[PDB]
Amino acid sequence: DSPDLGTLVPRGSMADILSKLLRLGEGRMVKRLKKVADYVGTLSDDVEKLTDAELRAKTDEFKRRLADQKNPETLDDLLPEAFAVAREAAWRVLDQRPFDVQVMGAAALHLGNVAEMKTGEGKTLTCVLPAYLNALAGNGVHIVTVNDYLAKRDSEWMGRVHRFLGLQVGVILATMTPDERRVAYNADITYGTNNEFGFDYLRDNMAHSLDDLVQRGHHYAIVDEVDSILIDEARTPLIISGPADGASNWYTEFARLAPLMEKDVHYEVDLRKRTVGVHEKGVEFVEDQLGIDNLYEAANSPLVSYLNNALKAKELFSRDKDYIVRDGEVLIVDEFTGRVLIGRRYNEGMHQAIEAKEHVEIKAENQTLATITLQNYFRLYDKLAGMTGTAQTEAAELHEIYKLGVVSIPTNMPMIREDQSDLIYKTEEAKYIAVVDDVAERYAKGQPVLIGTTSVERSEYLSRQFTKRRIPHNVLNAKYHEQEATIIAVAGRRGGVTVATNMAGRGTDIVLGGNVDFLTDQRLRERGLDPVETPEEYEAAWHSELPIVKEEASKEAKEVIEAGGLYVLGTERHESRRIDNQLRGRSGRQGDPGESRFYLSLGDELMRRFNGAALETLLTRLNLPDDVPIEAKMVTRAIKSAQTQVEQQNFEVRKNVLKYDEVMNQQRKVIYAERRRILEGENLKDQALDMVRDVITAYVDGATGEGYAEDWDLDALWTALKTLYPVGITADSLTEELLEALLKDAERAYAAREAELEEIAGEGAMRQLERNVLLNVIDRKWREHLYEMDYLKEGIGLRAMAQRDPLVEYQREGYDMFMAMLDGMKEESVGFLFNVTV
Amino acid sequence: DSPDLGTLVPRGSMADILSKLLRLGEGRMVKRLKKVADYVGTLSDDVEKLTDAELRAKTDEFKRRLADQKNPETLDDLLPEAFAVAREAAWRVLDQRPFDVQVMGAAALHLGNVAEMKTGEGKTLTCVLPAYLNALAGNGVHIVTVNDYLAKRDSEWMGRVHRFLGLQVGVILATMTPDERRVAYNADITYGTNNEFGFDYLRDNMAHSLDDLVQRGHHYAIVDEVDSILIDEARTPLIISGPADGASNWYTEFARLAPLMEKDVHYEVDLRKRTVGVHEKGVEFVEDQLGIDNLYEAANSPLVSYLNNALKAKELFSRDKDYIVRDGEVLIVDEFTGRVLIGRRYNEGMHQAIEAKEHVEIKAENQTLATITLQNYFRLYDKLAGMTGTAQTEAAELHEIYKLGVVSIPTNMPMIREDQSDLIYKTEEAKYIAVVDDVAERYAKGQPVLIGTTSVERSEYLSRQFTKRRIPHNVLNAKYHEQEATIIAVAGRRGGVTVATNMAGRGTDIVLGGNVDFLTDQRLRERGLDPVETPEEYEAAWHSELPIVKEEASKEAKEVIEAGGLYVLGTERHESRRIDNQLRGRSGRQGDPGESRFYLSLGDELMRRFNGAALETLLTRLNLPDDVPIEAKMVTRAIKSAQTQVEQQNFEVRKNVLKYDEVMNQQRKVIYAERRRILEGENLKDQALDMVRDVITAYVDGATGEGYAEDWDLDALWTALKTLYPVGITADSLTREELLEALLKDAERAYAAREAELEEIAGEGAMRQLERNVLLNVIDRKWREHLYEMDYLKEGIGLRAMAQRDPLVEYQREGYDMFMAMLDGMKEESVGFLFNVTV
């Protein structure tokens, strides 16, 4: 709740006023961000005057100014100076000094926003400034890129600047091991993909020892290509899947035991409470059949539930009454309708028991073992920002899901690219002969072309035409990213002809004359040099050779400027206007000249999914021939419409994925919390006993209800309690008082048990036993929740009536099993706490 | 405005109240019809007592009771008696006396409604009653059936009752000559298809002579299978096309002559009015070039129009401003957007003119020569009625378009057919094995099965599945009506299996134990007996054969009833629930036991048009086995809605077809009215002269609006008036608002001059014949030409649908403009040829 007068960086209250008059397009934020940038610039002499050793000592200066309690300074306080330091470092190390519009964008990202920075504005380098500043706080900065090649590359590339400044830079990649990941996460700044970050988080919350954890919290994340990761890729959740994890031999084993058991002799049935209770003879019978001395003895085999469940299966569920068998499938049927309630299975391992009862084949099965959406994953960070050339069109969604504002940073030079109107053809065949001719023309004239398509299949068709016209070219298909960067790096020398499927060659700049940085790095690496492996020599070689590389390329750059800049050819519209605009954006960087144009047809994938065929017959009827561009105002409105409709479809899909994810997200936050505190080693005696208390209290509450005199079933209550623990008093012992009695007995039984462990290998043995058993129970019963939650999602669709909203229905039913799951968790825990083999 | 107390049949004002109350299912009309029926029944006794000779004579009593001017009676006064007489005739002739509910429905049909009588209620014989009554008026009745086979059959079968009663019954068939149709139309009752009626109407209004007309007005039509014809079939217009037969040679020849001509010397452009005038000298240049004496001398060659267009083309339309040339087309582009306004062409021959100017290849085309929608065709009749088992769900459209109401007639016996609910399968594979297993089990138990499919391939697929399984069956594919009817007539014997794709074998009832009525006739026909060709012999043989065919059947009719009656198994769902219902309605005739069920799946064509595949992805993920029927409100919902969407789509197309047809329908009523006048030898002397007056007046109006004094071009006005007629006074002698009066008087005298020149060549009123030849020739050529342009206008107007514009409104404006332009050019060119044509 802060003031603004005489404060360079918008503090907090003032930041909101800007971060929100944002959506309103006035640009006070930009005006602000510009003032910050100017001021940073005025510090440029002060840093210029310093040795390499005097820079980099600055890291330690800032670090110490951040902790001294006498003269407290914050990151906002340090921003002018730290940005000056990072900027000068970048200049000395890379030979590239961040422009003013980069410093602006830097401020915007420190302030937690999406900086919309046009292609060729220096995204990757801008990034260094907020990454350095925040890295000083000492908690980690995560930098998210679109694939492993780019993560490794940016980490090694830019990590030069960070490393020059004292900091340590990490990268996570698909191949790394848990130990390698650890180190990368312990760095001051860590690069990686949403994938690797997400899954690491998933594996962490499945870990069995605190030592296996690889991440260290979620403090600050800068999401490179934000629209691609947070909007586009968000439609898909991350799922670690896996098999059931056993427990099938028991279902079969108890299905065989249950029928060898005389009703009223081994167990009793409460035909209208809908319950089963097992007698002394029954317990003992099961015990001797398994050569076991207690049904809660072997850890992680909840033999009480299995038994009970199997008896319920035998006694309480009737074949052809409640359910029918159909293909090794237990299908539940309506009361006296008699008709299969599709999607519906039985609860808390009862389905399995019924299956086992009906001798149904038991099959191999996978299920969710962990999940998070990219949405809820990135919502974990205390601060969040991102960068991209195209984000203003996702502002509303970025604000609603992430609280991320979008600031358009002005470009370094004025964009002068000619973005031409679509040429719409009648047929695919027509469009492509006309495409090939423009490209062949362009080639002969020297101009470099980038032609994008929308499928690998259409890239090879276009390259077959390209060879049938003898035009030397490459196709990039988005598979081998590195070798595709190499091509891209020289896509804008003259003669250049590059065909890119989807957005292939993402994030390497198509520089006219050639990418001077990319090429300099290549000279050095082919000679076996490395920024990390051979640091001093890479640096020295860099400074020496960059100007050479810059020469031979930028001599040819004047020639490429002559020929019109880059020609961007669109062969199809993408699944959103955003991406088309991204492709156009590949050209015209840094005020370079350049052309863009899309060729389209009523026969394109897009149009074919809507009304293109219908239009093509009409236009063929109106005697309009194939090789003529359509100027029809209505074919135009039709195209815009098709793409808009695709965009909205994807949005709905996203919106759904997340709204169905919130349910599970809430539940996992609780389950992860539980697992974490066990991992941490917390003393749980208080909760262990609370559960014992809780469980006894629940059981008394059920067997006693409201009945006055004799009425209470103490024998049933006693037997049900006696499963879990050695009850040290009789019902006769003392004949709401019945509960206060049993609790007190149970507590002593507990301290007795605790000392039994002390004797077995004690001095906290019961403290460990508590943790060990809990974690076990939680995991086993959580796995089963997820497997049952899987079936609930898939099915919830069909059970949607004449007005409902199935998400309410799913939410209702979903939390229900979640509570049931937690109750069952407590029960079996106290069970094992007393009776487990040590 | 009519009373009703003491009147049996609802007269005018009161039939109205009953018609209106109809759409609210209060059942008030059904009550009245029942009352009408009952009274007819009290009249049986009197007709039972008559000779056949005396019954046939009843027809002549009726006709003469209608033409009586002293004690005048209407068809409504005759309904009780004519109905009773038709009813008893039928009993005597067919050994089949129309039931009470048949008499009800008949009154409903006479009253101009759709009687909804269920399948097997006797639709086809019921209709004999209102047709007979109405036929008495002597203007003809049209019975419309779905195909030629059915038209021929009902005309011969039921014509037995009409011919006995003294009437003549005709049929029109796709194969008949004009002369053959004409006789058929002259009959008291004529059967036929919407196609045959429609096309005869179209062809009539193209006739070049009164003798050629085949039809004789549209007095009363009973549309059999109303929903199939007036709703489903309405999607599609009737069109006669042909070669444009254009004046391509003249456009070419005038494209040549236009540049040889010199501005201000041969002709004069007017950059403001968008006008060209050919000078004295030009007229003679073209005259010499073609070797002609007057530019109106050659019949059907409006050389004045062609020449003026070529010049306008030359002077008034600019290549690369107003239009461009691309791939042998003229494409109009905007003044400045510069963009190709595709669709658009120029008007009144200007487009051709410009094409020729640009040395463009002139391709021969086919064009519309006449068209009507079924809607506007059937709107022609004074009375309209219809029969069907399923009308009630189309009531609103039937009322909006046709002003037809729908009375549900109650059935003879209570309907006891068991209509089972859909079995829906996850896959197409599984549904078909369920179907075959069912057909298998029911073959074994004796019971006849009708299996419906929605394509021929699926029908064929099911044939093989059956054969693979030793079940003898039949497939009817809708191709061959007489033989598929033959299979149908026995589909209801023990062991019947019949695969009917789409609705094959419509109009023949699947009678249990076998179709006695059908089989008797088939016998009689094998013996060379024919109801028209050997009337008396057919009758006598029919009377002895029927009771026999009946015996031979009845034994196993008992057995098919025991077996459960007909079983109707549907294989997928049709494009509307209505059709689905028609299939079900094949079972359960006249009280008979029966059962229907449809087997559906999420891979049916219908579902696959929509979300069907999505559903089976879901269902498999839920582990439901392929062969377990799906009962889920959500899947029932999705099947309903696929079908509903199809209905809705069909309804919209239907709405669109008629919307666009109204514009042209108005236009052709005018033109048809013209052609008739001419074709009927009417004296057009006055019309001729009004056109003469009309055209001269407009020329004057155009040369003499403002200016007042000698600010007029009397040179141009004279030169142009001279194209049309021998102006006998020429300016000078006049120099007001007169000159119009002067010049008219002059033309009037010139007309009498012409007229005499004609009597001088051919004589005694021969100029009358010139006004007729010339008017007809000019209309037909100019309207034929208008259709050609209206062809192009209709196609490309769908390309004008921007946000808020309604393409129908623009199409009306422009279409109506061309229509009016066309009309003016009709007048002009007519006076030209009238004055100057070679005789």
UniProtKB/Swiss-Prot annotation, chain B:
Q: Which GO terms describe its molecular function?
A: ATP binding; protein-exporting ATPase activity
Q: Where in the cell is it found?
A: Cell membrane; Cytoplasm
Q: What's its EC?
A: 7.4.2.8
Q: Does the keyword GTP-binding apply?
A: no
Which residues of this UniProt protein bind ATP? Answer: Q102, G120, E121, G122, K123, T124, D509
Catalytic activity reads: ATP + H2O + cellular proteinSide 1 = ADP + phosphate + cellular proteinSide 2
Q: What is this protein called?
A: Protein translocase subunit SecA 1
Query: What organism is this sequence from?
Result: Mycobacterium tuberculosis (strain CDC 1551 / Oshkosh)
Q: Which gene encodes it?
A: secA1
